[PDB]
Symmetry: C4
Subunit: 431 residues, 4 copies
């Protein structure tokens, strides 16, 4: 019989709650200070509907410390009592039985809004809008208090000054002026503008103005703090890029760094920023625990797996392991690399693109579109020179493994090692 707290009707009712909150919180001070009709019935049904809201909250489930979803509305009643229940009941209890300062039930009703502010917030802009709303409500309350003070003082007052400024000698000025000007004065001494139209004359008004500038200074400082925090959070990335640029530039300046080489270094730096954005993929990859890494590495072997004939029959564990042990050597187009006479323990395949091998003005291995090169590991397995020098060409992505790593991972499982060695296809072996 109990409803769940994820019910959409509950969300609609909560939005209606917020609408009532703002409506009463703005109307009641204005009517109590500046000022029959169905509005009295509306005021009564406000508390009636908040009692109904208490009933719904008892009906709808809640989130306990241990149990996220719990039945038995009695438990809802028992935890809610002696707490938010008191606040909501006070907000729902009329005191009809003038004197409007006792109407703190509306004031305590925003405690519920502060309870649900986290649900309200989705990003930082809504926070700025919320502080703007608080700006408006604070201004309204201060203007109403100022209007009350001005009325009380009247038996040279600010009201006389207003009557002298806008033509209405006294009777007195109309109701619209006595509120627009009150808000005008409130904003006058909140943002430290200081107009000359209206200004306190009596001592009580001066003390009130003192409190006003104190509160305004505090909240204005809060606004600057939040704005500065947001701006710095946004521009931290640009500051970071400046930092990498600074280290690159100082390193280049410190070590002579001949001009063609400085040009290549800055080119590679800007290229790396283009896609990495400074953030290395290795760190985030290593942050994932075990099986996540094994699964995600296989997504990179979507270029070599399906094109290599033997690897179709491989087991899933072997594929995931070897996926953890492939490294796609990312290189900008037009790079020279390992030459003849170097080490041959670093085995190399291709993933995409194309490259050239000029072993003394002889063009070989112009392949690279999911292509295969390398050396025989069963018999030869000797370091030294394989074919010769590799030359610069278009987009350079190769496929790295290691001589020791491949053999040790392959010998653990013999049948597919035999399958791979028997079906050892190379598009162009570097010989």
């Amino acid at each position: 019989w109990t409803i769940l707290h994820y019910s959409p009707f509950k969300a609609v009712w909560d939005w209606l709650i917020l609408l009532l909150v703002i409506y009463t919180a703005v109307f009641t001070p204005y009517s109590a200070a500046f000022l029959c009709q169905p509005l009295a019935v509306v005021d009564l049904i406000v508390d009636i509907m908040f009692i109904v809201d208490i009933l719904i909250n008892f009906r709808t489930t809640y989130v306990n410390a241990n149990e996220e979803v719990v039945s038995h509305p009695g438990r809802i009643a028992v935890h809610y009592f002696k707490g938010w229940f008191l606040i909501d009941m006070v907000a729902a209890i009329p005191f009809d039985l003038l004197i409007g300062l006792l109407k703190t039930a509306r004031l305590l009703r925003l405690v519920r809004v502060a309870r649900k502010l986290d649900r309200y917030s989705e990003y930082g802009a809504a926070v700025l809008f919320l502080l703007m709303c608080t700006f408006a409500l604070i201004a309204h309350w201060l203007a109403c208090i100022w209007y009350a003070i001005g009325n009380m003082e009247q038996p040279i007052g600010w009201l006389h000054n207003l009557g002298d400024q806008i033509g209405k000698p006294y009777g007195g000025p109309s109701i619209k002026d006595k509120y627009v000007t009150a808000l005008y004065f409130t904003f006058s001494s909140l943002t430290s503008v200081g107009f000359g139209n209206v200004s306190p004359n009596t001592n009580s008004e001066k003390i009130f103005s003192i409190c006003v500038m104190l509160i305004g200074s505090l909240m204005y400082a809060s606004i600057f703090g939040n704005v500065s925090a947001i701006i710095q959070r946004l521009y931290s990335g640009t500051a970071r890029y400046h930092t990498q640029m600074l280290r690159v530039r100082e390193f280049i300046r410190f070590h002579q760094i001949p001009n063609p080489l400085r040009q290549r270094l800055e080119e590679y730096f800007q290229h790396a920023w283009s896609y990495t954005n400074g953030i290395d993929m290795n760190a985030v990859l290593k942050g994932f625990p075990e099986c996540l890494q094994a699964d995600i590495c296989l997504h990179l072997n979507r270029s070599l797996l399906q094109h290599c004939k033997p690897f179709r029959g491989a087991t899933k564990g072997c594929l995931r392991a070897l996926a953890m042990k492939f490294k796609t050597t990312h290189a900008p187009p037009g790079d020279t690399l390992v030459h003849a006479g170097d080490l041959l323990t670093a085995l190399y395949f291709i993933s995409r693109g194309s490259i050239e091998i000029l072993r003394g003005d002889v063009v070989v291995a112009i392949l690279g579109k999911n292509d295969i090169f390398g050396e025989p590991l069963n018999l030869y397995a000797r370091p030294g020179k394989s074919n010769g020098d590799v030359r610069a060409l278009t987009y350079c992505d190769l496929h790295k493994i290691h001589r020791d790593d491949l053999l040790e991972v392959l010998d653990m499982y013999p049948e597919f090692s035999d399958h791979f060695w028997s079906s050892l296809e190379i598009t162009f072996n570097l010989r």
Copy 2:
């Protein structure tokens, strides 16, 4: 005979000292500028009680550079002399023998407050309250200076303007106005409001006001700096969470990251944020020196120790070592893990929860509530396939060990190794 400086009566006396500080520092300028009775006796007994305070400070111990607690009040007298003793004696010496500017003893008495500000502070809010108190005292002093200037100039002055504004032609205005309006003018030219009620007329008050807005600008800048620092300290955590979210999002975007996999990655990311809050437990665990780590790791073996029958008879050193060398594999509910045909050097038990093992549609090992699975290490000890594939289930916490690590730690002490091998219970051996 000497009292200790941690005496609560000393704390009560220090609070009375602070009360006297604020009371005199507020009252004396107001009485000297704007203004018999027991107040003269009160003023005299202020200095009398501060001499008594000097006597108590000699009686109560102090904290030396080497010795935290030291007896022999003579030592207290000797270090205190030629220093804070001079300040406190000047604060305790009356100059009765008008002219109130020589009453710098109260002004020097706040040097003691600055000496004890660190004790006063517990959190940052008290600092903001202290700066608000400085606001109030600075305002009071500047208003008193303004009132003195206004009185001195009077033989078109701002006093005449005040008499013209509030009805009191001249005689002159009452005492209450000549102070409330002074404070009003003080706050007028500190928060950059600039009202039109009161404003400087001759050169002297103009120069004084220039100094006023200079000081106001400086200290207002200080207020904004402190507020911004506090706000950024508070929201650094949210900024951090934004940073992790940014790296996750950019990594997902950069590498295609198929949709089910991106969903699992973001799910694990938010899960990790839920409890870790970015901070890995491994770093802080490794931050502790040796024995602290050994003691704290045993607190995690409160689930496997008491339920494993042989481990009751184990020696405490062996238990603390093994505690340092268990790793509870935290995994979100519904995870798949190592399959058949993989390496079996990573031995595994369970800590809490439950998991499933489907080795080709056969449900085995549905246990997990402090249960034990694995392989026999005395004879078999061979990698390969143990039982088959593990499947996704509810809350996934296992118990990680290592084949070489456990054997090397166990062979160091033979008797309990024999006990463990003899009483080698497994809830369901993966065979």
Copy 3:
């Protein structure tokens, strides 16, 4: 037939676009509010030349998502339509067929500038200039709104106040005043100055001023945020240096650190700051992938390569590998180092400068200008004492290698190992 989007004539035309944008945006509100001639023809040819601009954008290429450069202007048309094309069409369509609020074509024309602000920006100063331009345009618009309100209200208004202040009783004041004073009032209520010359009288201008104060507060907060971010970005380096000095100072204070030794430590600290600036070269060197490191390390072997006779015949693989594996020991002038009886596996050479070897008051090896010292490795290869103690001298750059690395890299290349051992020249072997 299609033009390329990197054409300089396109850049000149875009500059003309911006010029027309600013002129139209500043002139049209002023003429529509405060205010035949060739200006009507100018206004028409504005839209005509913007239609021509649409034609040029059709002719000139664009950058697609996949293809940086794309031909076939039909593709440009199909991608451009239903989007920015509508913006420039509205900006280029006259509505001649008063009422100037419909002239949103200029207002939307700033959006096309806004998409290109990234190209316009080169550094942060241009951003500040752009926000100053926004200040000017916003002020102009708000002043025009104020002037319109003042005209509409006139059937005690601020126009009467202006006529009373500057002599022009009423007829009415001249056109120049009714704009300069409007801008003056606009700046009055944006920077929170609050002059007394002009001030709102009726309700409408009070509400308008309220809106102005809110906008000014928000955008002033934005200005402070940007300025603070820029300043902190500039002074982050000094902050880093101060933090480094704090670590050095606290370490020195914590561990006694005898005075001559503290002097040497701090001297080395500012020495390292002089060229490293905190930034270690090792991290950035290891940041480069493989071949970049091999190429860049050879730039440091421009001192010993050409002076060592056997290394001329060395293969480029030898040069790149060894250059990757030489380490120049940077040391401030006047340093003492490894003595007799120490480890001799750290084979040492020189790169530049000079040093002294006093093995009991005997001056040997005063060399160092691309000089060679060391030990025989073919036969002797024994650690212990080589010659004796090294003493402090002028600028200390040695040349570090290590015993095991050199043999294991050099034996793999037998012909050059034989060449090096046969031609093993040492300026002064430490014996």
Copy 4:
């Protein structure tokens, strides 16, 4: 014949230069706008002494790009010419031959002040004083411009307003008022105060005020940025401490962390903060290159070296190695440590303090004041239990070594190994 640029007389002359800079830069606008005598002679000898300064700068050396100290003043002249020489000559060339705007020589003289600002600055407070000086000079110049505008306009002006406010109907007001009020107005529209005493009347002063508040807003933003940067630099350490405390607290909360253990953890955290202040000594120690580390480690062996009899005969290489390879185990008073049945590869001595060994209610080894305990390494050298359990006592400083490290470092040096083994003293061997 040439003087050196580190001459103290040069420093005195530079201070005189700065004094002349400020004196002329302040006096000349005031005399040229608001306003025979020896002051004309003073003005002439200003340029004469600046020509003398050019002569001295030629005589005194300078710092070249390569050579820090360079002789041959001809080189000084040739490097100085076409640059700072032009600025200083213009500052030293009178234009006597009214019109005071051509007196830009004083304005260009501050370019040298900006050239030497780095020498002037020692800490950040001098920077704030410099910006305050800029505040004063800018205010003075703007007030002079305002006075010039007011004088030019006079044929309702602000001069008439001033004459109406302070009694001086017109003749006209005295000179002191016409400057104090100008400066008052200048500060009025820079700090956004906005008084009502003086305010622009015609268009020209309104535009001038526009420029004034624009400059004021910009430079006020600069002031806030600098202040905030300084404050955050100061409070970064407290931020670091709070972050560390947050890590500790979240770790404690996340893992239950029984109450006595949480108390010990927080105690150790605050104890580590007491002297480390978060900064580990290991990182800074490892930052020093080689010989610095070897020298600094010996400073920690000032407690065990002189008290161990064999170590007196040790060679300095022996000493540097051994001192490098101890780690003094800092432990808070009252700690328990390695028990019986553990591993004995971690050899241990003591450096200061005292500890207890209760191997089943038997008090042994209550020593610790530069005392030695351990095991025989020649014959026994077996892990296991040595004496039993160590118990909590006062300040716990032990002396850590390692079984494998010490044997390998000591057997390399046979004679001292024999000396140490023969004279192998132990205060209490744990048996």
